[PDB]
Structures are given as C-alpha cells and as structure tokens.
From a paper:
In this work, we describe a novel protease of S. canis, termed IdeC (Immunoglobulin G degrading enzyme of S. canis), which may be involved in bacterial immune evasion. We demonstrated IdeC is a cysteine protease that cleaves feline, canine, and human IgG between the hinge and CH2 regions, defining a new virulence determinant for S. canis. The structure of IdeC presents the α/β fold characteristic of the papain superfamily of cysteine proteases, consisting of an α-helix followed by an antiparallel β-sheet comprised of four/five β-strands. The active site, the canonical catalytic triad for papain-like cysteine peptidases (Cys-His-Asn/Gln/Asp/Glu), is situated at the interface and involves residues from both domains.
In an attempt to better understand the structure and function of IdeC, the crystal structure of IdeC (residues 30–339), with a C94S mutation to abolish catalytic activity, was solved at 2.7 Å resolution. The crystals belong to the P32 2 1 space group with one molecule per asymmetric unit. The electron density map allowed perfect modeling of residues 48–339, whereas no electron density was visible for either the N-terminal residues 30–47 or the polyhistidine tag, indicating an inherent flexibility at the N-terminal end of the protein. The catalytic cysteine, Cys94, mutated to a serine in the structure, is located in the L-domain, whereas the catalytic histidine, His262, is found in the R-domain. Asp284 (also in the R-domain) completes the catalytic triad by forming hydrogen bond interactions with His262, orienting its imidazolium ring for the proteolytic reaction. The oxyanion hole is formed by Lys84 and the peptide amide of the catalytic Cys94. Interestingly, a sulfate ion was present at the active site in the structure, with one of its oxygen hydrogen-bonded to the Nz of Lys84 and the amide of Ser94, mimicking the interaction of the scissile carbonyl group of the substrate and the oxyanion hole, which was also observed in other related members of the same family. The remaining oxygens of the sulphate ion establish hydrogen bonds with His262 and the side- hain of Ser94. Residues 254–261 of the IdeC structure form a loop that is equivalent to the prosegment binding loop (PBL) found in other papain superfamily cysteine proteases. The PBL in IdeC, interestingly only eight residues long (in other members of the papain superfamily being around 17–18 residues long), partially obstructs substrate binding and is structured by hydrogen-bond interactions involving the main chains of His253, His262, Ala320, and Ala321 and the side chains of Thr254, Tyr255, His262, Asp284, and Asp286.
Author numbering: 48 to 339
C-alpha cells in the first residue's frame, strides 16, 4: 500500500506476467539501469560488478555537473591507463550508461578489471567495486568485511574521483553494507526503508544456484504493508536477459524461518532465495561541498 523508490528513479508501470514473473521492460532515461550479462565466459559470475555498475550509472546521474566539472580540471583522471594500455575512458561510460549489454563500464569490468574472475569461480562485493572505482581502494577477492578505511595505494583499476573522495577518510566512503542473514522481516524492512528514503541506491544479495558465490541484484523500489514490513521489492537482474527489465519479487519468511525473495509468493512449496546482504550507495552530493 506504501511504495518507496530510489531518488532519481521514475517507477515503471508497464508490468506484465513473464516466464520469471511480473516484470516491466527496461526503458532508458528513467533513472534505473539494467546491466545484463552476455555470458561470454568473462562475466558469468560478475552479478556484483553489474549490480555495482548499475549503482554507478545512478551515481553518474546524481552528480552529473559535479562530475563533468571534475573531469575538465582533472583530465588525467578521465582515463584508466597502465602497462601502456588504455583500459577505460570514463566519458565513454557516461555516454553509454543507458545501454544494457554493451555499456562501456560493464565492458571494462568484465574485460579488464575482473576478466579472469569467473574462470577462477570467484566474485566481488558491490561495495568493494564502488569503493575501488570511486575512491581507488584496492579490492581484495578474499575480503569478507567492509573496505578498510585507511590511507593506501590507489588501485590502478579505479580511483577516478579519488582527488575528491579520498582514502582513509570515513567521510569520503560512499558505500555501506549490512548482513541480512542475522535479521528478521521487521528489521530488514525498516532498514531498507530508511536507506531508500535517505536517497541511497540499494543492492541486495541472496543465495543462488552456485555454492561458492552469492547473487546480487539492484533494489530500486519496495512495497510495505500496514505493519511497515516488506511486502515486495522491485529489482533488475544481470542474469535475466535484457527483455525482462524491472522484476517484482515477493519478500517473506520461509519454512526455514529465513527472510527470502522470489518471483513467486513464499509458501511451503516455494522456499524462496534467502537474503544474505544489503549494500547501499549514497550520491555524496554534499561531499563536494564539505572540504576545509
């Protein structure tokens, strides 16, 4: 009965029943993004990096003018260039943020940043990715905690906007994570609601079919009932093909008593996918104006 959506995101309305479930096809310039995998081998396990990408594309919206100003003053930072390669151009990503399959940012992530990750059966965490790209924090594949906030070497695969968003300053770290596995429906519900009303972009993780790596999706919207508990969430999915777009997931407490999500209602025949983690991204619009 009450629905809340991410700052800068116009709610889709074109919801139809699909093979997965209720989905509204993607349309560009609506605030939300749907980076999707080509399953070319290099990106088969990068759902977190696609999720991260989505939130970055949203970040590029919320800070457009701020960004283009920064880049004309910091042209050096415009490209990612080491080893004698030109690995990435940030201006290309912004030009192509609206594209789903061929988005020049996701192209960077799968082809240059984490190419060998899927063959190694390893993934990343969305926050780690964003913290690498923006602040230039070195990403570890074996880090199961938040990014260590300390002054450190720039990750060569990131730090585009690290002349503003520095390392070793809590004020400059834009991301946040919460373990959902230790919480019940009530606490998770309110937790999503606060972060969403606080104009943050949301990414949720859950158990997939792979035993090593969790799946991660973008949480754009959320429906809450009388009680203030999550009734349903609206998400994009890297693994879902481009024709799907915004999916409606039901949220409930399963037989096992874990909070879970699925394309269909949670029942006894439908255990759902248990929610593992929540990752948030602030737009950091105020950050550009707090340095002295």
């Amino acid at each position: 009965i009450t629905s809340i959506w991410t700052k800068g995101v116009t709610p889709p309305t074109n919801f139809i029943e699909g093979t997965d479930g209720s989905h509204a096809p993607y349309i560009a310039n609506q605030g939300w993004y749907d980076i999707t995998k080509t399953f070319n081998g290099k990106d088969d396990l990068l759902s977190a990096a696609a999720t991260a990408g989505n939130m970055l594309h949203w970040w590029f919206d919320q800070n457009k003018n701020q960004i283009e100003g920064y880049l004309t003053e910091h042209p050096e930072k415009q490209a990612i260039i080491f080893n004698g390669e030109q690995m990435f151009d940030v201006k290309e990503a912004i030009s192509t943020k609206d594209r789903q399959l061929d988005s020049k940012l996701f192209e960077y992530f799968k082809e240059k940043a984490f190419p060998t990750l899927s063959a190694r059966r390893r993934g990343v965490f969305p926050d780690h990715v964003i913290d690498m790209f923006i602040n230039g924090y070195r990403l570890s594949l074996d880090n199961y905690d938040k990014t260590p906030v300390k002054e450190g070497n720039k990750d060569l695969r990131g730090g585009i906007f690290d002349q503003v968003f520095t390392r070793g300053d809590q004020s400059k770290l834009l991301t946040n994570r919460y373990n959902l596995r230790t919480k019940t429906i009530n606490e998770i519900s309110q937790l999503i609601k606060q972060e969403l009303i606080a104009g943050k972009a949301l990414a949720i993780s859950h158990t997939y079919n792979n035993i090593g790596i969790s799946h991660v999706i973008n949480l754009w919207g959320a429906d809450f009932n009388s009680e203030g508990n999550l009734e349903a969430i609206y998400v994009t999915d890297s693994d879902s093909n481009a024709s799907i777009g915004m999916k409606k997931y039901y949220v409930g407490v399963n037989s096992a008593g874990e909070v879970a999500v699925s394309s269909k209602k949670i029942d006894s025949e439908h255990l759902g996918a248990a929610a593992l983690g929540l990752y948030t991204l602030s737009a950091g619009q105020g950050i550009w104006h707090q340095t002295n």
